[PDB]
Swiss-Prot record, chains A, B:
InterPro entries to which the protein is assigned, alphabetical: Catechol_dOase_N, Cchol_dOase_prob, Intradiol_dOase_C, Intradiol_dOase_core, Intradiol_RC_Dioxygenase
Enzyme class, broadest EC rank: oxidoreductase
Pfam families assigned: Dioxygenase_C, Dioxygenase_N
Cofactor note: Binds 1 Fe(3+) ion per subunit.
Biological-process GO terms, alphabetical: beta-ketoadipate pathway; catechol-containing compound catabolic process
UniProt KW keywords: Aromatic hydrocarbons catabolism, Dioxygenase, Iron, Metal-binding, Oxidoreductase
Entry keyword Transmembrane helix: no
Cofactor or coenzyme needed: Fe(3+)
Protein's name according to its UniProt entry: Catechol 1,2-dioxygenase
Known catalytic reactions: catechol + O2 = cis,cis-muconate + 2 H(+)
Metabolic or biological pathway: Aromatic compound metabolism; beta-ketoadipate pathway; 5-oxo-4,5-dihydro-2-furylacetate from catechol: step 1/3
Amino acid sequence: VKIFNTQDVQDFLRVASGLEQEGGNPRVKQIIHRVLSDLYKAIEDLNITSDEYWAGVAYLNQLGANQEAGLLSPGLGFDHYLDMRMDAEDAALGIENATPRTIEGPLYVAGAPESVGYARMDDGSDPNGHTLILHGTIFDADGKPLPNAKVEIWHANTKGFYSHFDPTGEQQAFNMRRSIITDENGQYRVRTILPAGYGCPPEGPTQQLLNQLGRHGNRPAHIHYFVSADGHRKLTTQINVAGDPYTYDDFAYATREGLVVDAVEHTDPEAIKANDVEGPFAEMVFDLKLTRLVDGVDNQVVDRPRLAV
Amino acid sequence: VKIFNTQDVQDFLRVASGLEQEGGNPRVKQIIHRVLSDLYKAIEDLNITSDEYWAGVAYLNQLGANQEAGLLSPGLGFDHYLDMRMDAEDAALGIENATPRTIEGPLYVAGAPESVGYARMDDGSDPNGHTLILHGTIFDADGKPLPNAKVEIWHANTKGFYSHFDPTGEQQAFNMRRSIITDENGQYRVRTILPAGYGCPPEGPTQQLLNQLGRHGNRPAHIHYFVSADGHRKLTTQINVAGDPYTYDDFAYATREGLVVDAVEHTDPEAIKANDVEGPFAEMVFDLKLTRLVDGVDNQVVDRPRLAV
Ligand SMILES: CCCCCCCCCCCCCCC(=O)OC[C@H](COP(=O)(O)OCC[N+](C)(C)C)OC(=O)CCCCCCCCC
Ligand SMILES: CCCCCCCCCCCCCCC(=O)OC[C@H](COP(=O)(O)OCC[N+](C)(C)C)OC(=O)CCCCCCCCC
Ligand SMILES: Cc1ccc(O)c(O)c1
Ligand SMILES: Cc1ccc(O)c(O)c1
Ligand SMILES: [Fe+3]
Ligand SMILES: [Fe+3]
């Protein structure tokens, strides 16, 4: 029993997609027609039953009810795939990406405190927090230190929770989220704590689907970056804390060579005083290099829904 | 950009689908691998940008947040498509379906009061309700009246709202929802009111998408039926009130020839007095004929999540 390639079904697909309708958006119709065709065909090819189908529809409802579509997305590789496409396009334009891009993730929040050159990111409310001094230089497309660049950093606490998405309700707004404008030497520097790896809500729809694929929902400890500057494209990337068990087994497939960074532990009193901290701390250095706009246009910035507080 | 066909993307798709993982459900992995492959390819063929992609992800959260995946499904033709498959399968088995099946819709509620041969379905709470006497006979696969068949009926009020899903504040539980056991002559008879067509929540995600396709989100006035009996398959169908503006332009594509019924209006005192009502009323007669089990089993019953009370 096969009906997908019969006139009845093909004509019905055009009707449902609004192809012969006068109103609407032709681009949406075009995409919907393709997606529907593909799904109708997959239902036939894989002999998906009604019981299976409705289980899929129920999952969609709970996926959205839990606001997890942006979490499942990277877990199913879309986020990284979109990055592969941008990389391919840059290669086509002859653009060399000194600092590789990687996924943004769904947890960026607009509105964080802004400062010049330095900022402390945490409020010391984490018991198990280990002091981290993260600093670096931002370079322009010509390799020269870039003053006034805006470096945005966000990461999780030791429990693997992000402010604004913390279930324990423990964190104040923008905790571990800052914008640092680079100083005269093109440098940025922050005092924060070493993040812990992130895990998907174990009871949520994203993890339940991953369980069906025999997969885990963990990410290694990492730090997110947005770096923007006049005359340059906006850089989206992240660094991984070297040594993490999941560095090369991230459920979001965000790891890339060049982004794994070593956290050097400092114990002597000399270093501690020089970075005036209260005791042993970790230090990470990470420089980032920007690319220039293409004929005055940032051909790769992404406009997507982001929480703004 | 064309990278879908490279080994890097093809292997990635296998990894993301857990195909190389030992745990999990092989059936789910099989379906996920196909759906991801098709979508990754659709993104390439249609050159879907990251901006477009994330609008799609946001829409998915909104769809589930409003619990409308089961409303969008029929709007995009899936529900009707699944029935087409069922019809094709029956046609191949030589099963002549006397009463045509059509979609269940997402508003069935389990546990309605039950009675033999007759019941009034509404609580008279609808100010504009017009009395409707709906009756008919249930026939077995041989064309013989079937006593003891269970006829389940549910429908909307004059505002297009159903009990348990009324946006304006609860109706009596199970208002306009009843189960009727056919009597000694295989008949069912109910007193209720004429329903008004249903329209999708105007500001909801389903209507928002339909707008982009230049389509409306309306359904003609209709009455749902579930009919079950020993030795026969469970029938899912509905009847359309003849004359409705959307009879042949249902956004859920559920109307079928043989399911459009005329509601005859009675105003003469003799009719009124005979059916013992309090004034003019409408009458609809609709008989249903059932099909026998296939090798002792109901090959088309659908088990899907349904609200129970
Ligand atoms: C609005 C239009 C939307 C159209 C969408 C069409 C998608 C196609 C549908 C495919 C559905 C896959 C069917 C999976 C399935 O048949 O069962 C999936 C599991 C169930 O667990 P079981 O243990 O098997 O249950 C049974 C326990 N018993 C045996 C004891 C009874 O549950 C799950 O959530 C996995 C399902 C998630 C699949 C979502 C894919 C989409 C993501 C982009
Ligand atoms: C987690 C894995 C899931 C992967 C899913 C991938 C989806 C495939 C890609 C989807 C591409 C959709 C592109 C839609 C688009 O580019 O714009 C869609 C419209 C927007 O209207 P505009 O007027 O342009 O808005 C702007 C008005 N301004 C200019 C004034 C600001 O909005 C909408 O909600 C329409 C959205 C339709 C998408 C639904 C898909 C579901 C199919 C089952
Ligand atoms: C997809 C995703 C989930 C959690 C994170 O912390 C992150 O950076 C990305
Ligand atoms: C999709 C849909 C919407 C409303 C209804 O009353 C119905 O039966 C089906
Ligand atoms: Fe993160
Ligand atoms: Fe209905």
